[PDB]
Design a protein around this ligand. Structure first.
Ligand SMILES: OC[C@H]1O[C@@](CO)(O[C@H]2O[C@H](CO)[C@@H](O)[C@H](O)[C@H]2O)[C@@H](O)[C@@H]1O
Ligand SMILES: [Mg+2]
Length: 580
DNA sequence: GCCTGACTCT
DNA sequence: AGAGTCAGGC
């Protein structure tokens, strides 16, 4: 059965109505500078398919695309907006994005095409993209009649589905979350991705060469100490060398044999010199394969920029993710790895990189939502939260907090945030379950409000079926009623963690929106380049630094008002590395 | 081609 | 707790 539509060869006025479902199809997973393979419009006057070489060269269609008062309903408008930016065309007036609507209604559905969103409301008159385009090697744009019918069915689905999605969003009290947060954020992310980040490829290559030399040296030491050559990057081959040839103790096994995970290796270190060398080899090898070679693979040779894609409709807690490359996991913890950041530079001469980050946003959020008196007071005094947590758990003065005590209190703070469990904490601090339970017990004695919150949120998740964040993002937790201890326990941790991690995600998203508006009002040339969960990275003329130093922290700090202050630290420099 | 297990980040 | 990428290997 084949849906009726006009296969148009020229644009007409009735295609330019002030309300329409719009499909601007980009089949390449990475949409940066990618082809647009077809366009479909469904509105009051009918259903239309347009070839892109026709539509995009029509002045009236382009004018309609960029006219803010002509409203469009779409799926994944950021994909279209970005593909259109590369062609020098502005997309405006997108008042409804079905991908973002589906994501807000239930992030666990993993909706990634119109068909999956449609299935949520018993609408099935549209094919999954994978059925049409195929998968992997055999992936391909089909012939025009098939392609056209597909885009029109997607448009028609968007047209039919807008009202029930908005209606449910409204009952969820998530209508503003879509309209005033996620959709405006989607435009901001499109600009960030399109702007891209400049890479000093010569610097990267130099680092690659030094790395290659050190890798060879560690590699040869490894063969020396094992008394033979083998594939160090083969967990199978390595396990044989470690646990059979060298007789190292077996403390952990994988599902598939011996575990050679990094924490297993740390413990083995005192037995044989080879172990530290393997850890080092693996550190350097990760830098080499992923942050030199992999990174250089995705730099555009023409502009020396990388253009990540932020997935805004993926994570279960409302964070963004980043791909091709992932710019949210660039090394920082170890100095040799952190040097990778010297290769990320401003895109114009006499510009600098500026980075601002919230300090302890998750614990500040927890203090607000739990209304824990002790925790709120700690932030009101702007104390070192880890030292203060140690003072309370160990019942000592600040003077008596040793480094090991602070380290352990820090670890409990992590656990408390992730949904605390004696097992997870024990694993982390290399201690017994009974020991870990005493820590948690001491914690809850010092922060009774936090304990009440943990109990109350788990009950609420049971009662309601979901938990929510500050700005009404929602996560359903059906395993919270499971009679399987481990399944139920995962869900209980999720109930505890999600309002924390998710409310922190909400706050920085709102900061981003506020920041973008302030930058425009101030006519600054500064631009957002990246978000890394609790931090924003910008580039700007060196002449705007002093202004950004006052502006960016204030905007981020005032994004929401909590029972405790938000605090933002900031730095700038000639490279991302230097913005520290 | 998918999987596993290893690594990277907040 | 939440993510993404890579080499080895089936
Ligand atoms: O365009 C991003 C948007 O598309 C989806 C599918 O609807 O993901 C596709 O694009 C991502 C970016 O290239 C890929 O990582 C992903 O594999 C691909 O299916 C959504 O998940 C995402 O929000
Ligand atoms: Mg921070």
């Amino acid at each position: 059965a084949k849906m009726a539509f006009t296969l148009a060869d020229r644009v007409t006025e009735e295609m330019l109505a002030d309300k329409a479902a719009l499909v601007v199809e980009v089949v390449e997973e990475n949409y940066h500078d990618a082809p647009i393979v077809g366009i479909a419009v469904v509105n009051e006057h009918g259903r239309f398919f347009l070839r892109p070489e026709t539509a995009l060269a029509d002045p009236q269609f382009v004018a309609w695309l960029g006219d803010e008062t002509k409203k469009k309903s779409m799926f994944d408008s950021k994909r279209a907006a970005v593909a259109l930016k590369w062609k020098g065309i502005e997309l405006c007036g997108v008042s409804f994005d079905l991908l973002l609507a589906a994501y807000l209604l239930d992030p666990a559905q993993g909706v990634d095409d119109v068909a999956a969103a449609a299935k949520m409301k018993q609408y099935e008159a549209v094919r999954p993209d994978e059925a049409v385009y195929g998968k992997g090697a055999k992936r391909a744009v089909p012939d025009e009649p098939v392609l056209a019918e597909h885009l029109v069915r997607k448009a028609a689905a968007i047209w039919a589905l807008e009202r029930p999605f908005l209606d449910e969003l409204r009952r969820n009290e998530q209508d503003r979350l879509l309209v005033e947060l996620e959709q405006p954020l989607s435009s901001i992310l499109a600009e960030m991705e399109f702007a891209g980040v400049k890479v000093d490829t010569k610097r990267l290559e130099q680092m690659g060469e030094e790395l290659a030399e050190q890798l060879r040296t560690v590699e040869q030491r490894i063969y020396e100490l094992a008394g033979q050559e083998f594939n160090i990057n083969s967990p199978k081959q390595l396990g044989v060398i470690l646990f059979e040839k060298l007789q190292l103790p077996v403390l952990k096994k994988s599902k598939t044999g011996y575990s050679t995970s990094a924490d297993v290796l740390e413990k083995l270190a005192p037995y044989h010199e080879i172990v530290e060398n393997i850890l080092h080899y693996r550190q350097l090898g990760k830098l080499q394969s992923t942050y030199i070679e992999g990174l250089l693979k995705v730099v555009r040779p023409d502009t020396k920029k990388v253009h990540t894609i932020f997935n805004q409709a993926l994570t279960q807690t409302g964070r963004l993710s980043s791909t091709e490359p992932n710019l949210q996991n660039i090394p920082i913890r170890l100095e040799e790895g952190r040097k990778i950041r010297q290769a990320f530079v401003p895109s114009e001469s006499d510009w600098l990189i500026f980075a601002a980050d919230y300090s302890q946003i998750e614990l500040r959020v927890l203090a607000h939502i739990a209304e824990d008196d002790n925790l709120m007071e700690a932030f009101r005094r702007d104390l070192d939260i880890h030292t203060k947590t140690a003072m309370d758990i160990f019942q000592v003065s600040e003077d008596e907090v040793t480094p090991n005590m602070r380290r352990q209190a820090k670890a409990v703070n992590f656990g408390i945030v992730y949904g605390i469990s004696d097992y997870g904490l024990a694993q982390n601090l290399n201690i017994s379950r009974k020991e870990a339970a005493e820590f948690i017990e001491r914690y809850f004695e010092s922060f009774p409000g936090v304990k009440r919150y943990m109990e109350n949120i788990v009950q609420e998740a049971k009662q309601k079926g979901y938990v929510t964040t500050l700005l009404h993002r929602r996560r359903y937790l059906p395993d919270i009623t499971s009679r399987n201890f481990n399944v139920r326990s995962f869900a209980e941790r999720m109930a505890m963690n999600t309002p924390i991690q998710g409310s922190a995600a909400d706050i920085i998203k709102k900061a981003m929106i506020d920041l973008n508006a302030r930058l425009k009002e101030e006519r600054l040339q500064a631009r957002l380049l990246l978000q890394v969960h609790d931090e924003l990275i910008l580039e700007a003329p060196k002449e705007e630094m002093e202004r950004l130093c006052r502006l960016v922290p204030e905007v981020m700090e005032q994004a929401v008002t909590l029972r405790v202050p938000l605090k933002v630290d900031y730095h700038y420099g000639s490279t991302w590395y230097d913005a520290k």
